[PDB]
């Protein structure tokens with residue numbers, strides 16, 4: 001299955017957001033991250049990807065397709081707006097085994113706020 005997540009200058013949750021900020025996909029599914037507004041990218045957050053997963057970082061303004069294979073939770077950020085909380089979570093599969101490692105990772109306050117809310121949306 002193929003999903004899309006947009007990087008936006010604003011949305012419902014304020015400025016500098018991923019929409020949706022939380023998404024659950026099956027292993028093997030793809031997500032295309034779309035900087036619909038200029039000035040955004042997508043990058044894995046250090047400490048917030050499961051075992052077997054690769055870190056990734058898109059170029060600013062590129063639509064970036066990732067095929068998620070390793071089960072677990074993934075925290076992602078927009079590199080330039082990470083300090084203003086421009087983050088999202090992708091959960092791949094059920095019962096993510098890295099949940100306690102993710103929940104422990106260090107983030108800017110505004111990022112941590114939105115990550116916690118995203119994790120919670122997923123029912124974690």
Ligand SMILES: [Cu+2]
Nearest residue numbers: 039040078081
């Ligand atoms: Cu951005």
